Design an enzyme around this catalytic site. Sequence first.
Site, PDB file in Angstrom:
ATOM      1  N   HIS A  40       0.830  -1.184   0.000  1.00  0.00           N
ATOM      2  CA  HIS A  40       0.000   0.000   0.000  1.00  0.00           C
ATOM      3  C   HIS A  40       0.874   1.247   0.000  1.00  0.00           C
ATOM      4  CE1 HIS A  40       0.161   0.432   4.674  1.00  0.00           C
ATOM      5  NE2 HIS A  40       0.090   1.664   4.279  1.00  0.00           N
ATOM      6  N   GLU A  52      18.780   8.203   8.270  1.00  0.00           N
ATOM      7  CA  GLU A  52      18.061   9.350   8.766  1.00  0.00           C
ATOM      8  C   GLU A  52      17.776   9.308  10.244  1.00  0.00           C
ATOM      9  OE1 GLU A  52      17.332  12.046   7.413  1.00  0.00           O
ATOM     10  OE2 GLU A  52      16.673  12.092   5.417  1.00  0.00           O
ATOM     11  N   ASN A  54      16.603  13.006  12.076  1.00  0.00           N
ATOM     12  CA  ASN A  54      15.693  14.070  11.709  1.00  0.00           C
ATOM     13  C   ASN A  54      15.437  14.075  10.176  1.00  0.00           C
ATOM     14  OD1 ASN A  54      14.573  16.708  11.078  1.00  0.00           O
ATOM     15  ND2 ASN A  54      15.173  17.289  13.102  1.00  0.00           N
ATOM     16  N   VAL A  57      16.366  17.643   8.568  1.00  0.00           N
ATOM     17  CA  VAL A  57      17.661  18.301   8.688  1.00  0.00           C
ATOM     18  C   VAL A  57      18.726  17.420   8.106  1.00  0.00           C
ATOM     19  CG1 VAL A  57      19.417  19.155  10.373  1.00  0.00           C
ATOM     20  CG2 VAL A  57      17.082  19.669  10.644  1.00  0.00           C
ATOM     21  N   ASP A 171       1.110   2.341  19.943  1.00  0.00           N
ATOM     22  CA  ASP A 171       0.824   1.743  18.635  1.00  0.00           C
ATOM     23  C   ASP A 171       1.569   2.439  17.498  1.00  0.00           C
ATOM     24  OD1 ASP A 171      -0.648  -0.027  16.791  1.00  0.00           O
ATOM     25  OD2 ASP A 171      -2.532   0.951  17.190  1.00  0.00           O
ATOM     26  N   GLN A 174      -0.531   6.565  11.285  1.00  0.00           N
ATOM     27  CA  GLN A 174      -0.297   7.117   9.947  1.00  0.00           C
ATOM     28  C   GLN A 174       1.084   7.760   9.819  1.00  0.00           C
ATOM     29  OE1 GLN A 174      -3.733   7.143  11.256  1.00  0.00           O
ATOM     30  NE2 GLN A 174      -3.810   5.389   9.890  1.00  0.00           N
ATOM     31  N   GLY A 175       1.807   7.242   8.839  1.00  0.00           N
ATOM     32  CA  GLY A 175       3.161   7.660   8.562  1.00  0.00           C
ATOM     33  C   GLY A 175       4.139   6.570   8.956  1.00  0.00           C
ATOM     34  N   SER A 177       3.526   3.308   8.155  1.00  0.00           N
ATOM     35  CA  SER A 177       3.351   2.211   7.211  1.00  0.00           C
ATOM     36  C   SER A 177       4.600   1.818   6.465  1.00  0.00           C
ATOM     37  CB  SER A 177       2.310   2.533   6.164  1.00  0.00           C
ATOM     38  OG  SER A 177       0.955   2.630   6.610  1.00  0.00           O
ATOM     39  N   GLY A 178       4.766   0.507   6.264  1.00  0.00           N
ATOM     40  CA  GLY A 178       5.916  -0.034   5.573  1.00  0.00           C
ATOM     41  C   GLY A 178       7.110  -0.266   6.488  1.00  0.00           C
TER      42      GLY A 178
HETATM   43  B1  LIG Z   1       0.121   3.891   7.032  1.00  0.00           B
HETATM   44  O1  LIG Z   1      -0.551   4.254   5.787  1.00  0.00           O
HETATM   45  O2  LIG Z   1       1.134   4.942   7.265  1.00  0.00           O
HETATM   46  C1  LIG Z   1       1.668   5.745   6.145  1.00  0.00           C
HETATM   47  C2  LIG Z   1      -0.976   3.442   8.174  1.00  0.00           C
HETATM   48  C3  LIG Z   1      -0.383   2.735   9.418  1.00  0.00           C
HETATM   49  C4  LIG Z   1      -1.548   2.530  10.379  1.00  0.00           C
HETATM   50  C5  LIG Z   1      -1.064   1.857  11.648  1.00  0.00           C
HETATM   51  C6  LIG Z   1      -2.227   1.354  12.486  1.00  0.00           C
HETATM   52  N1  LIG Z   1      -1.739   0.729  13.694  1.00  0.00           N
HETATM   53  N2  LIG Z   1      -1.888   2.489   7.520  1.00  0.00           N
HETATM   54  C7  LIG Z   1      -3.094   2.838   7.056  1.00  0.00           C
HETATM   55  O3  LIG Z   1      -3.551   3.987   7.215  1.00  0.00           O
HETATM   56  C8  LIG Z   1      -3.982   1.789   6.388  1.00  0.00           C
HETATM   57  N3  LIG Z   1      -5.336   2.015   6.869  1.00  0.00           N
HETATM   58  C9  LIG Z   1      -5.799   1.745   8.092  1.00  0.00           C
HETATM   59  O4  LIG Z   1      -5.138   1.247   9.027  1.00  0.00           O
HETATM   60  C10 LIG Z   1      -7.277   2.111   8.182  1.00  0.00           C
HETATM   61  C11 LIG Z   1      -7.371   3.560   8.643  1.00  0.00           C
HETATM   62  N4  LIG Z   1      -8.015   1.242   9.072  1.00  0.00           N
HETATM   63  C12 LIG Z   1      -9.311   0.991   8.924  1.00  0.00           C
HETATM   64  O5  LIG Z   1      -9.943   1.509   7.995  1.00  0.00           O
HETATM   65  O6  LIG Z   1      -9.939   0.157   9.853  1.00  0.00           O
HETATM   66  C13 LIG Z   1     -11.146  -0.623   9.719  1.00  0.00           C
HETATM   67  C14 LIG Z   1     -12.369   0.340   9.751  1.00  0.00           C
HETATM   68  C15 LIG Z   1     -11.344  -1.668  10.844  1.00  0.00           C
HETATM   69  C16 LIG Z   1     -11.063  -1.492   8.427  1.00  0.00           C
HETATM   70  C17 LIG Z   1      -4.199   1.869   4.845  1.00  0.00           C
HETATM   71  C18 LIG Z   1      -3.780   0.548   4.330  1.00  0.00           C
HETATM   72  C19 LIG Z   1      -3.485   2.974   4.140  1.00  0.00           C
HETATM   73 CA   LIG Z   2      18.264  14.144   8.094  1.00  0.00          CA
END
Ligand SMILES: *[B@]([O])(O[C])[C]([C][C][C][C][N+])[N]C(=O)[C]([N]C(=O)[C]([C])[N]C(=O)OC([C])([C])[C])[C]([C])[C]
Ligand SMILES: [Ca+2]
Length: 223
Positions: A40, A52, A54, A57, A171, A174-175, A177-178
């Site tokens: 994703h 990396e 910061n 910077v 936990d 967002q940000g 991921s991966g």
């Molecule tokens: B990621 O995109 O960071 C850049 C982020 C990590 C989330 C970590 C959670 N512990 N991943 C996402 O945002 C993914 N989406 C979700 O996790 C969504 C928001 N969850 C969701 O919709 O929950 C249900 C309603 C139960 C299905 C997606 C893959 C980008």
């Molecule tokens: Ca840097």
Amino acid sequence: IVGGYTCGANTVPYQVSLNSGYHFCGGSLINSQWVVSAAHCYKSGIQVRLGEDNINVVEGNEQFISASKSIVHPSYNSNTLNNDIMLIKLKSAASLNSRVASISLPTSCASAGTQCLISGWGNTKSSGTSYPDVLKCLKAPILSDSSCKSAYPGQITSNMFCAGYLEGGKDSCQGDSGGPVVCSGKLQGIVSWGSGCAQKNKPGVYTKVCNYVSWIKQTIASN
Ligand SMILES: *[B@]([O])(O[C])[C]([C][C][C][C][N+])[N]C(=O)[C]([N]C(=O)[C]([C])[N]C(=O)OC([C])([C])[C])[C]([C])[C]
Ligand SMILES: [Ca+2]
């Protein structure tokens, strides 16, 4: 990362930031020319930024290298997020040192109870937003498959695991991921999805890397 701590500059040497003009996802360096991240996180024109702390910077330990090709898993399903793993090859090999290092791929899947380190430049708040400039770390255990499947009825496949706290408060978010989930020095998970962040009874879900090791070795070997 919600409820974690500042890692310290270059103490997680396999952590990459994927940049397309701004940080959009993390990843793990698994050898000098290949990165593993979440499918994703796919997009065109990714520059991989290694060493990396910061991300705003230039501090001196960074290596910024373009991706030559991206390979999303052949069975990635964006609707179920089943098989959320992708490989990125760098245009040139990175120079590995104590601050830029690859992480080992597992030979066995890790058990429930195993403590892991999760890291990333993602959102630190569970309501509202504050994105850090320096890398944040969290230690979280792998949860049993029963707890994970009762938190997300009908959504957990065999290629997913939950790691975190059923009480919430700590936990990935967002940000993140991966990014890596590392347990006993082996890359065991990739930050994938969850219901919000640090919500009670809604732990993070992670791609289970031990399931993909033959696909990862075979693809590297032929590309
Ligand atoms: B990621 O995109 O960071 C850049 C982020 C990590 C989330 C970590 C959670 N512990 N991943 C996402 O945002 C993914 N989406 C979700 O996790 C969504 C928001 N969850 C969701 O919709 O929950 C249900 C309603 C139960 C299905 C997606 C893959 C980008
Ligand atoms: Ca840097």
